[PDB]
Design a protein around this nucleic acid. Structure first.
Lengths: 490, 321, 437, 148
DNA sequence: AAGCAGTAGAGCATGC
DNA sequence: TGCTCTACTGCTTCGATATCG
DNA sequence: AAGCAGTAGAGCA
DNA sequence: GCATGCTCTACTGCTTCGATATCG
């Protein structure tokens, strides 16, 4: 569906060994799990802040759950990422946090098996929303928790199937006991290690997919089909403030009005005119006339002929392009016609040209529909989906004209050394990763404000170049490139 | 606008440089003042804004009692301005420095995001910098070597990265500049495939019908024995019609101050319409495709608008008998 | 049964695990206010009023100790949808408990943010002010401030949605109907706030009309015009504008559903017709056509609200033609030939021709002004028409007893005017009216 | 899903058992007549299940034996007349705590079901051996006190 | 735009 | 009677505000 | 509601 | 022959989110 949120239960193994440092001095796997869980909450509190996140430790001494099972202790409950819940969470670090774990719940017991999955199931059942994905993320190391009883093993693989059928899928981040890919054992049936994607990799993201407009494409007379204009590059910005009463920290319910005809008394909106002075005199209208003087067309796309893909110069530009698609919701039998027109436009390299009105009262606007075709391999790479593209087109007063009157050339020798410089600085561009420093430092400012930890975590500036790794990279040709013909010569 | 900066490659290659703006969205600089009825004056009304509370009534607060907060998770975190003014980014003046370069054109049409186009030209004043950058453009034009700039306006502004592609023009070759998306902008999802469609597969009769329609509906033609295409109906020279509609409507109410709204002039629709000879040419294949494809599928002022029969013969009636 | 289901309703307010307690509140209120309705004894009904309306526990301290929350909203809706019916099972014996109900409704409106809990807390207040009439308590329900609140909130509030701008527009006119002693100064500044909106929702050529504001503004104007009349005598322009707006609200329209604009334009017509009487003249043809059209709309409330409009139309043009029956002779002849063409038809319905018979007995009056014999052609034509339809012919094998009211009303309306009653048909007139007895 | 599942299961019992672990997953989500439909499904396959009680008390059975209906509160007692003779009196003494708030109920069929479960809980908890704990002797003390 | 949730209205069956 | 400060200042870019689907 | 250089009126000489 | 009683289906308005135009 559309508003089906993502779910995640964290399930941690605190039974026998990980609370101890595995007889090492580096990092206990318990601290590894708590750091990963805290980083996932910190990432999804601004990445996907409508989802569901629970956390459950099993194998501990004392117990609390709604089922009343022995030695299963839940910590939080299925809700949003909350700052107070992560400030509860971050108290289990180091030896002092290990002893806090001891005095709060105590580790070590005869840990049972699939009843922990039953508690996960009843934690998923009692939600009063809709959920798209159901993922159980098990943080453990060991291999045989049914090392003596075989009926416990059969019951474990029965209850795992009872979670398999109603749509609950689990993966276990297998804690490497020596630090390697060693245990190639027999839980490939229950499942459907690397933790860096849980550790850093999602500091700024948002989850959304909207249709933006659902219009009609007409071939200028009566022949009408449906189309829907999705969006791809939306220029995201930080969320805006909220006014607040600094005594008790409550918002203040702003209300405004217009009043005072120089005596006292309100003015309900029926007794205001809309005016424009032009020097001496005024021009008065009504609100309905000053909203009516922009009305040209019904909403949609009327087609006005076909032009090849070559003579439209794709540097004429004023707004980002959107992306059509042929729904079969308004009319029926539209994907057939659009696929036929698309393959003929492709094999004849031609593009449509249209007049476009988005909403129920908008002045008209000329657009160019340029086709595109998909691409797919065994790895399922996806750079293009199979539709069109609406290049917006300027009309006449978008283009300015530069003064233009200089023309002096030089000798064709610097092009070779500049070719050497650009080949020195030659690389594949990217696929991602030039993130916005202002938004990212604001994110971490808000993290340190709501968590009072230490300081602004200074975001690394990827937008900045690498001048140390560029100047010595190119070397001692910059002096000759500077002083072949052009020093400033004083 | 002459925006001045210094294009420095590495840390030593200084090129004094100016950039002018180009294709941009255009609007009109005169909004509608709100006056009152029956006195027709601006100052006769004034607005107020108050912030009350959510008690039984409006136990108000004042301007000196309000801090801004932000949503964070499931609460609002306070500490309005001196906090978020002290812990702000600093841009260190203007920046026009080259980030890198590229060869394989994965930079393409559909990934631009930047609602202007900066034509970055040159400088004046004994153009050593401009002959240096024309060497740069004269080295970039003969290959697919694009440039990538970091650009920002001022210390209050926001930082930008953008494509710089050389040109194709006779009198000049000045470098273009578009902005570029960031890692948070480029969301992308899974639109379905159309080729291996067992239900929506088109018949080649319909394919050649649509091909006949495309051949019947062209808009640019190669003529005059220079063997290049020349375009009919260019949608890059027409002036924008909504300000002309506004112009003539304000002229109308300035002249005849009682009349209703005039409907739109006719030459405006002629100019915004194509030459209908292509409609006359396409009259036949459009009817053809309408036959051969299968069965496809209130404004307020418009919603509320013996002897009796004897004397019957003697006086006047219809025919007899 | 109650007060245990009230102390537990106060027990599920401060306890933890909220939204597990809001459902307990809904469970308790639906079982309380269902038992508190099926009770026919004034003993236990004399108790339960004081249990429910108490001050320690009870259904009015809940909505003041559970209002700064969001989970309890189904509960705070259910209370205000129950009190609109417990004001109906009872009557005027909620006389002491009434300023507290008014304060509950005013605060639940002004402190809440929904619009499904601002509708039942404006049905309760309207039914309250329509039970406690022009009476004593209206100096306690302080109208001089309850007007200024709900009249400031049309300016100092942005986007009050649709079905809250209905009931605000209706409650601003009920205060001019009941208790009109305090609304002398501020009913002159209410016709402008009823006409500007009603213009904007019907003459604007940019948008599509919102019909549940037209319903509310017509139902508010139709009760401000009681006790604050604007006839066509002293300043006949505002009544012309009200006639034009009701006349756009009754045009012979397109086919529709959601009949709530015609069924409010017609009821503004069928009561306050006398204010506009000159302007009611020259549109007699089209008005008669559309009211006969709407008179059989196969909808069992649109017929009932069209018939009285037709009757008041006929009765209010009759006293204008019978005042100056020299230049209105073509009007008189047209109405007469129309009633004749109705009654000569051989049709199905009795309310098809009963309106014709009553119109003929109405217009029997102004024939005396021009001929003084055609009245005597009547009352013999009428009695001869009236007897054999049901007296002799099928005395017991007919289904025709449903137009004898229009028969006797018409006979009386013609019998009033003439002199020299012709003395022979009276022993059948006194079989007639004893047959109606 | 649940509408047609109720239709098939009203005429055929043993097609519930593929879905019996997926009706309980849905049960805290249907606040209407559909909850009566799920409980109508549940009653077909109670006499023969293993435990049922942990899932029932985990799915908040107490605040759903106390809503307002007659059909819901009749099926909510037909399952409890089904699952008497397999429970232990540590939990039957918490089941007999909200089923004896049916002395002040209308709808004589619902009271008939109540005085129909109490009639067995008196005759087969008379303790025919000598003595027991303070629960198997307290359920008799609260069912010798509504049958009077 | 998207989901949903609540009420108005029409047609079958009944009564005086 | 001669060259730098200075009042303005047009513009330009975020930032808050309001509308619409 | 905030900055950035452009274009004519003042101050010491 | 007229009034009422009862159900189900399609119309319609609300709520939340995101994108767009406007005014400083």
């Amino acid at each position: 569906k559309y508003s089906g949120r993502d779910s995640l239960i964290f399930l941690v193994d605190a039974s026998k060994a990980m609370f101890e440092s595995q007889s090492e001095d580096e990092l206990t796997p318990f601290d590894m799990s708590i750091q990963c869980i805290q980083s996932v909450y910190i990432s999804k509190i601004i990445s996907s802040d409508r989802d569901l996140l629970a956390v459950v430790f099993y194998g501990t001494e004392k117990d609390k759950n709604s089922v009343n099972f022995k030695n299963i202790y839940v910590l939080q409950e299925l809700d949003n990422p909350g700052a107070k819940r992560i400030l509860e969470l971050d108290q289990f670090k180091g030896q002092q946090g290990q002893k806090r774990f001891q005095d709060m719940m105590g580790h070590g017991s005869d840990y049972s098996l699939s009843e922990v999955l039953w508690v996960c199931a009843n934690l998923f059942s009692d939600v009063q929303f809709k959920m798209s994905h159901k993922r159980i993320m098990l943080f453990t190391n060991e291999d045989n928790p049914h090392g003596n009883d075989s009926a416990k093993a059969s019951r474990a693989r029965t209850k795992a199937g009872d979670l398999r059928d109603t749509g609950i899928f689990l993966d276990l981040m297998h804690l490497k006991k020596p630090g390697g890919f060693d245990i190639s054992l027999f839980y490939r049936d229950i499942i459907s290690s690397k933790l860096e994607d849980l550790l850093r990799k999602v500091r700024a993201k948002e989850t959304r997919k909207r249709a933006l407009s659902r219009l009609k494409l007409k071939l200028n007379k009566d022949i009408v089909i449906s189309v829907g204009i999705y969006n791809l590059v939306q220029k995201a910005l930080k969320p805006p403030p909220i006014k607040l009463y600094r005594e008790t920290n409550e918002p203040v319910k702003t209300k405004t009005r217009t009043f005072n005809t120089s005596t006292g008394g309100l003015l309900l909106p029926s007794d205001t005119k809309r005016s424009q002075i032009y020097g001496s005199r005024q021009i008065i209208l009504e609100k309905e006339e000053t909203e009516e003087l922009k009305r040209f067309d019904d909403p949609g796309l009327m087609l006005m002929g076909f032009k090849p893909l070559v003579l439209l110069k794709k540097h004429h530009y004023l707004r980002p392009s959107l992306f059509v698609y042929p729904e079969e919701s308004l009319v029926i039998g539209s994907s057939t016609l659009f696929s036929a027109l698309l393959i003929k436009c492709l094999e004849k390299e031609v593009a449509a040209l249209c007049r476009y009105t988005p909403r129920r009262n908008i002045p008209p606007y000329f657009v160019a529909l340029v086709p595109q075709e998909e691409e797919l391999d065994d790895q399922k790479i996806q750079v293009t989906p199979p539709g069109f593209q609406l290049v917006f087109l300027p009309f006449a007063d978008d283009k300015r004209k530069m003064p233009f009157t200089e023309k002096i050339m030089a000798t064709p020798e610097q092009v070779g050394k500049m070719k050497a410089i650009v080949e020195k600085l030659r690389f594949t561009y990217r696929s991602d990763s030039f993130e916005n420093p202002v938004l990212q430092q604001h994110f971490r400012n808000l993290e340190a404000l709501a968590l009072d930890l230490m300081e602004p975590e200074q975001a690394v500036d990827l937008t900045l170049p690498k001048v140390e790794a560029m100047n010595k990279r190119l070397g001692s040709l910059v002096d000759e490139f500077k002083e072949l013909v052009y020093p400033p010569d004083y | 606008i002459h925006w001045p900066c210094r294009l420095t490659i590495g840390s030593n290659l200084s090129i004094r440089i100016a950039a002018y703006k180009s294709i941009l969205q255009e609007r009109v600089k005169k909004t509608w003042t709100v006056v009152d009825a029956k006195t027709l004056k601006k100052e006769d009304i004034q607005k107020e804004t108050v912030y009350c509370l959510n008690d039984d009534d409006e136990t108000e607060v004042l301007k000196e009692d309000i801090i801004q907060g932000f949503r964070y998770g499931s609460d609002i975190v306070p500490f309005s301005k001196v906090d978020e003014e002290q812990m702000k980014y600093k841009s260190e003046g203007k920046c026009f420095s080259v980030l890198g370069f590229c060869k394989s054109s994965q930079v393409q049409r559909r990934f631009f995001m930047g609602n202007q186009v900066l034509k970055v030209f040159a400088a004046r004043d004994d153009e050593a910098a401009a002959v240096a950058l024309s060497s740069l453009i004269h080295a970039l034009d003969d290959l697919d070597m694009v440039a990538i700039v970091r650009y920002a306006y001022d210390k209050r502004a926001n930082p930008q990265v953008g494509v710089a592609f050389p040109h194709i023009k006779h009198n000049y070759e000045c470098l273009v500049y578009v902005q570029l998306p960031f890692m948070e902008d480029l969301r992308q999802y899974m639109f379905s495939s159309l080729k291996n469609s067992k239900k929506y597969a088109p018949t080649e009769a319909q394919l050649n019908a649509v091909d006949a329609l495309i051949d019947s509906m062209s808009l640019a033609k190669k003529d005059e024995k220079t063997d290049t295409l020349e375009d009919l109906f260019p949608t890059t020279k027409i002036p924008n019609p909504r300000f002309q509609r506004l112009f003539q409507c304000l002229l109308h109410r300035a002249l005849h101050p009682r009349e209703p709204l005039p409907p739109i002039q006719q030459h405006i629709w002629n100019m915004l319409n194509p030459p209908a000879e292509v409609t006359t040419k396409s009259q036949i294949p459009l009817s053809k495709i309408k036959t051969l494809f299968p069965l496809i599928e209130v404004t307020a002022q418009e919603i509320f608008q013996a002897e009796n029969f004897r004397v019957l013969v003697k006086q006047k009636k219809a025919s007899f008998e | 049964g109650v007060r245990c289901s009230l102390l537990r309703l106060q027990e599920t307010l401060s306890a933890a695990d909220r939204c597990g307690a809001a459902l307990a509140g809904h469970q308790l209120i639906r079982g309380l206010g269902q038992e508190c309705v099926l009770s026919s004894s004034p003993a236990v009904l004399a108790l339960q009023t004081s249990l429910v309306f108490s001050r320690d526990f009870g259904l009015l301290v809940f909505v003041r100790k559970s209002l700064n929350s969001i989970e309890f909203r189904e509960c705070r809706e259910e209370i205000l949808k129950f009190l609109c019916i417990f004001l109906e099972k009872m009557g005027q014996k909620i006389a002491p408990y009434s300023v507290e109900i008014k304060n509950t409704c005013t605060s639940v409106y002004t402190k809440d943010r929904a619009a499904k809990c601002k509708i039942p807390a404006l049905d309760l207040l309207i039914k309250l002010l329509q039970t406690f009439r022009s009476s004593r308590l209206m100096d306690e329900f302080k109208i001089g401030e309850l007007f200024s609140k709900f009249y400031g909130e049309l300016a100092l509030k942005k986007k009050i949605p649709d079905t809250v701008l209905e009931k605000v527009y209706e409650l601003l006119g009920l205060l001019g109907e009941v208790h009109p002693s305090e609304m002398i100064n501020n009913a002159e500044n209410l016709f402008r706030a009823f006409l500007g909106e009603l213009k904007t929702q019907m003459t604007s050529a940019v948008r599509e009309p919102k019909l549940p504001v037209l319903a509310g503004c017509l139902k508010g104007l139709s009760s401000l015009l009681c006790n604050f009349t604007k006839s066509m005598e002293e300043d006949p322009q505002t009544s012309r504008e009200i006639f034009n707006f009701v006349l756009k609200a009754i045009r012979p329209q397109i086919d529709l559903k959601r009949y709530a604009v015609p069924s409010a334009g017609l009821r503004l017509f069928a009561l306050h017709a006398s204010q506009f009487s000159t302007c009611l003249l020259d549109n007699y043809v089209s008005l008669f056509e559309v009211l006969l059209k709407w008179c059989a709309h196969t909808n069992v409330e649109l017929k009932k609200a069209a018939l009285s409009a037709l009757e008041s139309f006929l009765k209010q043009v009759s006293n204008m033609v019978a005042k100056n029956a020299e230049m209105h002779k073509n009007k008189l002849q047209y109405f007469m030939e129309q009633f004749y063409g109705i009654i000569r038809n051989v049709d199905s319905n009795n309310k098809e021709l009963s309106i014709a018979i009553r119109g003929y007995g109405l217009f029997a009056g102004p024939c005396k002004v021009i001929n003084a014999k055609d009245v005597d052609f009547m009352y013999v034509e009428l009695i001869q028409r009236c007897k054999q339809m049901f007296l002799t012919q099928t005395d017991t094998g007919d289904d025709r007893v449903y137009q004898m009211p229009s028969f006797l009303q018409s006979v009386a309306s013609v019998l009033l005017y003439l002199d020299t009653v012709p003395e022979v048909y009276t022993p059948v007139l006194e079989h007639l009216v004893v047959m109606q007895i | 899903f649940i509408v047609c599942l109720n239709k098939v299961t009203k005429s055929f019992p043993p097609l519930a058992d593929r879905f019996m672990n997926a009706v309980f997953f849905l049960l805290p989500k249907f606040h209407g007549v559909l909850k009566t439909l799920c409980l109508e499904v549940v009653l077909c396959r109670v006499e023969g299940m293993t435990e049922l009680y942990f899932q029932l008390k985990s799915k908040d059975f107490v605040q759903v034996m106390r809503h307002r209906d007659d059909e819901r509160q009749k099926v909510c007692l037909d399952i409890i007349y089904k699952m008497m003779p397999k429970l232990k009196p540590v939990e039957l003494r918490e089941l007999l705590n909200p089923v004896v708030e049916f002395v002040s109920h209308p709808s004589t069929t619902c009271r008939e079901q109540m005085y129909n479960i109490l009639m067995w809980i008196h005759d087969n908890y008379r303790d025919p051996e000598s003595e027991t704990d303070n629960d198997s002797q307290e359920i008799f003390k609260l069912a010798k006190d509504v049958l009077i």
